[PDB]
Design a protein around this ligand. Structure first.
Ligand SMILES: *[C@@H]1O[C@H](CO)[C@@H](O[C@@H]2O[C@H](CO)[C@@H](O)[C@H](O)[C@H]2NC(C)=O)[C@H](O)[C@H]1NC(C)=O
Ligand SMILES: *[C@@H]1O[C@H](CO)[C@@H](O[C@@H]2O[C@H](CO)[C@@H](O)[C@H](O)[C@H]2NC(C)=O)[C@H](O)[C@H]1NC(C)=O
Ligand SMILES: *[C@@H]1O[C@H](CO)[C@@H](O[C@@H]2O[C@H](CO)[C@@H](O)[C@H](O)[C@H]2NC(C)=O)[C@H](O)[C@H]1NC(C)=O
Ligand SMILES: *[C@@H]1O[C@H](CO)[C@@H](O[C@@H]2O[C@H](CO)[C@@H](O)[C@H](O)[C@H]2NC(C)=O)[C@H](O)[C@H]1NC(C)=O
Ligand SMILES: *[C@@H]1O[C@H](CO)[C@@H](O[C@@H]2O[C@H](CO)[C@@H](O)[C@H](O)[C@H]2NC(C)=O)[C@H](O)[C@H]1NC(C)=O
Ligand SMILES: *[C@@H]1O[C@H](CO)[C@@H](O[C@@H]2O[C@H](CO)[C@@H](O)[C@H](O)[C@H]2NC(C)=O)[C@H](O)[C@H]1NC(C)=O
Ligand SMILES: *[C@@H]1O[C@H](CO)[C@@H](O[C@@H]2O[C@H](CO)[C@@H](O)[C@H](O)[C@H]2NC(C)=O)[C@H](O)[C@H]1NC(C)=O
Ligand SMILES: *[C@@H]1O[C@H](CO)[C@@H](O)[C@H](O)[C@H]1NC(C)=O
Ligand SMILES: *[C@@H]1O[C@H](CO)[C@@H](O)[C@H](O)[C@H]1NC(C)=O
Ligand SMILES: *[C@@H]1O[C@H](CO)[C@@H](O)[C@H](O)[C@H]1NC(C)=O
Ligand SMILES: *[C@@H]1O[C@H](CO)[C@@H](O)[C@H](O)[C@H]1NC(C)=O
Ligand SMILES: *[C@@H]1O[C@H](CO)[C@@H](O)[C@H](O)[C@H]1NC(C)=O
Ligand SMILES: *[C@@H]1O[C@H](CO)[C@@H](O)[C@H](O)[C@H]1NC(C)=O
Ligand SMILES: *[C@@H]1O[C@H](CO)[C@@H](O)[C@H](O)[C@H]1NC(C)=O
Ligand SMILES: *[C@@H]1O[C@H](CO)[C@@H](O)[C@H](O)[C@H]1NC(C)=O
Ligand SMILES: *[C@@H]1O[C@H](CO)[C@@H](O)[C@H](O)[C@H]1NC(C)=O
Ligand SMILES: *[C@@H]1O[C@H](CO)[C@@H](O)[C@H](O)[C@H]1NC(C)=O
Lengths: 421, 107, 174, 99, 198
């Protein structure tokens, strides 16, 4: 069928009607970014001429072709640990949440490492590790410098810092603050007055806890969750399997088996057939290394994006639209994953709206009054000023509006009265 | 009469040991789910083409089928492979045998 | 059929007509002994990468050897005694294992790093992730700075690279 | 490391320089335990051969032969091999044989 | 070592060229790496074959060099794009992006040139000394919940003050520091105090 581009939804636009949300939802989204890739290493000499003195002596005629591929793969392996360090090792200390988990009603037991479990790893991290899934032949795999436990410890330190000190631990020293006050700042940062949080603190906490439960359910049921990290693992496994299979190719030789050529052909012909196999296998190695360099550049770009999100999303608060999920960004929580990072983005999304009549300014004594914050709305009998992102009508006073110009200039200005306390 | 061969007719393509591997090879195999002609031996022993190779199958309880003849004319004018399995003795010959108008073995 | 490797016992039930086995790479995996009808696996003579962990020659000529992803079992000069440290990266010989953690200096892998310290020698240790510092969190306490510092940091970024040009004709066929 | 980096000075760090491989101590030579000779004498020096249209086929089994006295023989006007060198012949223990 | 990020780039390019130069010494199966020694010794029917092998090897070496240079150039291009972004949002403006322009709260940046690169001097504000103060999300006066317009409420043990988040500067709580929203029965942890009316 012809694919749909989305539901059709006209906007009830008019020159004097504004929709302002009366209710809101706190949502948590999952953004998955690759950080590192398998640190492969290829023994070019053993791969091309495994346990063959004659083949090695013929390989010596290709100079540095071998060692420069070892150099390229070493550079890739090193930059993979650089990527991991850039993404996770952004905090100079290692904070730890205290036993009292009474964070204003916000339940973090599913993201903070479980003390009972040996390795400091959260329930969600345990779910993530259960989703992502040549030996004697030159091709080896190097371990990462930072073990999964150390990555979990870094994510625990970052999470504890974020929870107990907000953004202060990123810029300088970690300054403890009640979590509810941290959220009050997070609400002020998106144009929603902090009193909305305190009035709805229990509702917001329950919405956050329900969102976390839904994340747990989604990750514990749907098998197509970590489609960005599993695809990277699959690409690396496929590249290695193709490289291994390339040893079975003849490349024009009588046989892919070097020992079967050596036992059958005289030097004047065995050297030619071996030269053909060496050329084919060296071209295969060069193709593999080039593909690994391009994939590594993609992984490095992804790791740089992940580090940018870590710094400007977890350690701070992001004003960049849709950088940290759809909605108005409040906070983010890092979680480790095999060869990658998962960000839980907590954002404010307007949920319910009403059609109000609006005006750009109000006349009182001939002066044009404009809101300092928010907009003017009318329910049909009275004009009020309210914050843009949450319907909360207030009496129009001299502490809500300011005077600039006169009534004969502003197009669409309406007549009303401004109360003077 | 014809029946469905399903997945029968797979043999080891060579004498090399392989394990835990998916190996792609091109050879003369019986196509999967192809039609195979069903012959009866009750109450009918025609000569069939050999083409490029023949898949054969039999179901037994008393060893009724005891041999095969391969050739072109089966009339002593050319060489014809004769395979006979009598109780415990497999016999293979390539002689220029003079066969009967309807070859058979009596009990 | 020739090659180099360790011949070991196997539990692979070869069929009477099968003589050789092969791996994914199409190399020889096992053989049946032509004199005694047993199946022997051919495992290449155990191997792994050899890495040298060393301070610069301006400091010391002592080195440590990392045998990648092997046990400290199968292992001209460098023997297999004194200080042998088994890590998840492999068997490290020549580096002294220190219980005290420090910041990573020469990375080894799997959380293990090496450095040149004290009389001086190469040591290996689990790398530190940073000092431990709990936050005095409570529901009614806030820390607000009373003083500040203005700091200047240096961030260095490459912008361009040498504008090389290669005369392909003169290079290949000068 | 010095050879790997092509420098007499090695900077501080970790370098991958070689690969540990245990070396063999002795060679292992295995062939079928058979001490018989081939009928090549009665096949080459046979009294009468067959016509080309009725070409004769003689299978061989459980025997050992030295094709070096045949390659070194001027009696044979033509000695040409395909897929296997005629010189290196006493190495690879042959499998199937049909003369 | 402070400028290693640029020196390594220079070294990489030099190393690539040195490798390419060393590639001229390889035989690639030819009787000699020296083209003139082949030309002076072999007739066309064999010299052309040996030259074809040397051309194939040297062309493959050049292609490898060019591919490595293209990948490195793409990396340098990404770095240059990052540097231009930093110039625009760091030197020419003021960055609100956390840790984009150094650790701390960004104030300003200064460009400096460097061989094949740029150096940014990031001037940032970092809190240095701290005290433990008691806090509260809101203060009750007549039953209304008063919230700070900017900053937070702190107590030194006897008096409540309002102060900016990033610098301790206690001020008397007044109607010009706080605003009224809701009532005392809603806010969890609200404390009793007084708000001065000028
Ligand atoms: C925070 O959430 C966790 C899990 O969602 C809660 O732990 C559960 O508590 C219930 C009883 O309250 C038990 O029946 C479950 O078995 C617990 N889960 C696990 C995994 O053990 C925890 O109580 C919540 N904390 C608060 C303060 O609400
Ligand atoms: C705003 O929306 C929230 C949910 O998005 C509403 O909270 C729910 O209210 C119903 C009925 O009052 C309860 O049964 C649900 O349990 C509540 N949800 C949660 C998570 O507690 C809230 O009532 C809405 N408020 C307004 C004014 O519309
Ligand atoms: C528009 O909002 C105003 C402000 O609340 C409403 O005025 C009040 O309406 C309630 C309704 O029960 C009365 O009890 C109050 O006495 C009214 N106060 C004043 C000062 O008028 C007004 O009714 C709203 N209009 C509409 C159409 O919703
Ligand atoms: C808003 O109020 C002003 C004054 O209260 C209105 O201006 C009047 O417009 C009429 C129409 O021409 C004149 O006859 C009056 O003399 C004006 N008053 C003054 C004081 O100049 C204005 O029209 C009103 N606008 C709306 C949209 O109601
Ligand atoms: C805030 O910090 C600055 C430096 O970080 C302090 O300035 C120093 O103060 C000490 C004694 O207080 C003097 O001996 C130094 O000479 C000062 N240095 C400079 C460069 O002026 C400053 O006093 C601190 N202020 C407070 C209130 O703690
Ligand atoms: C908390 O801060 C207030 C405001 O400065 C302190 O009150 C003053 O303290 C000084 C101490 O030398 C007295 O001389 C003033 O007379 C006090 N003024 C008032 C209006 O009380 C208060 O002492 C501080 N509390 C503590 C424990 O240091
Ligand atoms: C803050 O002050 C209010 C009143 O000034 C306190 O409210 C009183 O609470 C007690 C205990 O339930 C009641 O018996 C009184 O009748 C309440 N007063 C009024 C006027 O209704 C409130 O408890 C105080 N809170 C704190 C933390 O001190
Ligand atoms: C505003 O009015 C239009 C008129 O059709 C309606 O479609 C729209 O849903 C209204 N807005 C809301 C929030 O209901
Ligand atoms: C708004 O649109 C209505 C549509 O009829 C029009 O009558 C009115 O004058 C417009 N007002 C302004 C300020 O454009
Ligand atoms: C077998 O024969 C029947 C009818 O004779 C035909 O419909 C069917 O397609 C045949 N099978 C195949 C695999 O072609
Ligand atoms: C089968 O036939 C062969 C051919 O003559 C004969 O030698 C052999 O003994 C027979 N075996 C049996 C069991 O009839
Ligand atoms: C060794 O390092 C010192 C400073 O660390 C330097 O002055 C000296 O020239 C260096 N020597 C060599 C041979 O590198
Ligand atoms: C090494 O082998 C011993 C026994 O031979 C075993 O107990 C030990 O766990 C092994 N270690 C590794 C790292 O394989
Ligand atoms: C390190 O500590 C352990 C105790 O867990 C002890 O058994 C071991 O001997 C110590 N090693 C050194 C070198 O201090
Ligand atoms: C055939 O006889 C000649 C001598 O007449 C001898 O030299 C040669 O080796 C013989 N060939 C074989 C295969 O025995
Ligand atoms: C705040 O109190 C905690 C309680 O242990 C203490 O460790 C910390 O140093 C205090 N902060 C200051 C700035 O004194
Ligand atoms: C703050 O925590 C203390 C811990 O004992 C508790 O007694 C107090 O009621 C809590 N207050 C609020 C508002 O959470």
């Amino acid at each position: 069928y012809t694919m749909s581009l989305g539901a059709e939804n006209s906007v009830a636009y008019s020159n004097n009607s504004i929709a302002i949300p009366t209710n809101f939802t706190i949502s948590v989204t999952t953004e998955i970014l690759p950080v590192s890739m398998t640190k492969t290493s290829v023994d070019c000499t053993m791969y091309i001429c495994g346990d063959s003195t004659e083949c090695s002596n013929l390989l010596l005629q290709y100079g540095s072709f071998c060692t420069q591929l070892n150099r390229a793969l070493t550079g890739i392996a090193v930059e993979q640990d650089k990527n991991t360090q850039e993404v996770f090792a952004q905090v100079k200390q290692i904070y730890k949440t205290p036993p009292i988990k009474d964070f204003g009603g916000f339940n973090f037991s599913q993201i903070l490492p479980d003390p009972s479990k040996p390795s400091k790893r959260s329930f969600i991290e345990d779910l993530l590790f259960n989703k992502v899934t040549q030996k004697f032949n030159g091709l080896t795999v190097l371990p990462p410098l930072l073990t999964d436990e150390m990555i979990a410890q870094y994510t625990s330190a970052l999470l504890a810092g974020t929870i107990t000190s907000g953004w202060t631990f990123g810029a300088g020293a970690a300054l403890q603050i009640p979590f509810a006050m941290q959220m009050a700042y997070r609400f002020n940062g998106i144009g929603v007055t902090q009193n909305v949080l305190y009035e709805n603190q229990k509702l917001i906490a329950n919405q956050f806890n329900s969102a976390i439960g839904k994340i747990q359910d989604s990750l514990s049921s749907t098998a197509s969750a970590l489609g960005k990290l599993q695809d990277v693992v699959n690409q690396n496994a496929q590249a290695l399997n193709t490289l291994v299979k390339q040893l079975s190719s003849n490349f024009g030789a009588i046989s892919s088996v070097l020992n079967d050529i050596l036992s059958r052909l005289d030097p004047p012909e065995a050297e030619v057939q071996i030269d053909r196999l060496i050329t084919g296998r060296l071209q295969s190695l060069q193709t593999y290394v080039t593909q690994q360099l391009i994939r590594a550049a993609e992984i490095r770009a992804s790791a740089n994006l992940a580090a940018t999100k870590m710094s400007e999303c977890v350690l701070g608060q992001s004003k960049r639209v849709d950088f940290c999920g759809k909605g108005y960004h409040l906070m983010s929580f890092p979680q480790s994953a095999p060869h990658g990072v998962v960000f839980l983005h907590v954002t404010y999304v307007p949920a319910q709206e009403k059609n109000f009549t609006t005006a750009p300014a109000i006349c009182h004594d001939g002066k044009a009054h404009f809101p300092r914050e928010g907009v003017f709305v009318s329910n049909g009998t009275h004009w009020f000023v309210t914050q843009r992102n949450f319907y909360e009508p207030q009496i129009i006073t001299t502490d809500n509006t300011f005077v600039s110009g006169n009534c004969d200039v502003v197009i669409g200005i309406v007549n009303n009265t401004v109360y003077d306390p | 009469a014809y029946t469905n061969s399903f997945t029968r007719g797979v043999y080891y393509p060579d004498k090399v040991f392989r394990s835990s591997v998916l190996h792609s090879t091109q050879d003369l195999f019986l196509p999967f789910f192809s039609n195979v002609t069903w012959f009866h031996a009750i109450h009918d022993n025609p000569v069939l083409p050999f083409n490029d190779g023949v898949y054969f199958a039999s179901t037994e309880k008393s060893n009724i089928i005891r041999g095969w003849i391969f050739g072109t004319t089966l009339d002593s004018k050319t060489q014809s492979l004769l395979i006979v399995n009598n109780a415990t003795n497999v016999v293979i010959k390539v002689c220029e045998f003079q066969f009967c108008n309807d070859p058979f073995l009596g009990v | 059929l020739t090659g180099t490797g360790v011949l070991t016992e196997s539990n692979k039930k070869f069929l009477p007509f099968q003589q050789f086995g092969r791996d994914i790479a199409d190399t020889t995996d096992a053989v049946r002994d032509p004199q005694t009808l047993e199946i022997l696996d051919i495992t290449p003579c155990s191997f792994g990468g050899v890495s040298v962990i060393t301070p610069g020659t301006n400091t010391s000529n002592q080195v440590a050897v990392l045998y990648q992803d092997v046990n400290c079992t199968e292992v001209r000069v460098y023997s297999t005694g004194s200080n042998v440290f088994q890590t998840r990266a492999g068997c490290l010989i020549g580096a002294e294992h220190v219980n005290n953690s420090y910041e990573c200096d020469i990375p080894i892998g799997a959380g293990i790093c090496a450095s040149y310290q004290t009389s001086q020698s190469i040591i290996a240790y689990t790398m530190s992730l940073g000092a431990e510092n709990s936050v005095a969190y409570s529901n009614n306490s806030i820390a607000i700075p009373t003083n500040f510092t203005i700091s200047v940091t240096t961030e260095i970024l490459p912008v361009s690279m040498t504008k090389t040009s290669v005369d392909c004709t003169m290079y290949i066929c000068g | 490391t010095k050879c790997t980096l092509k420098s007499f000075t090695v900077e501080k760090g970790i370098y991958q320089t070689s690969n540990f491989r245990v070396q063999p101590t002795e060679s292992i030579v295995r062939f079928p335990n058979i001490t018989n000779l081939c009928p090549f004498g009665e096949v080459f020096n046979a009294t009468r051969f067959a016509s080309v249209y009725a070409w004769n086929r003689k299978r061989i089994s459980n025997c050992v032969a030295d094709y070096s006295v045949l390659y070194n023989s001027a009696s044979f006007s033509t000695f040409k091999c395909y897929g296997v060198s005629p010189t290196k012949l006493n190495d690879l223990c042959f499998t199937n044989v049909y003369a």
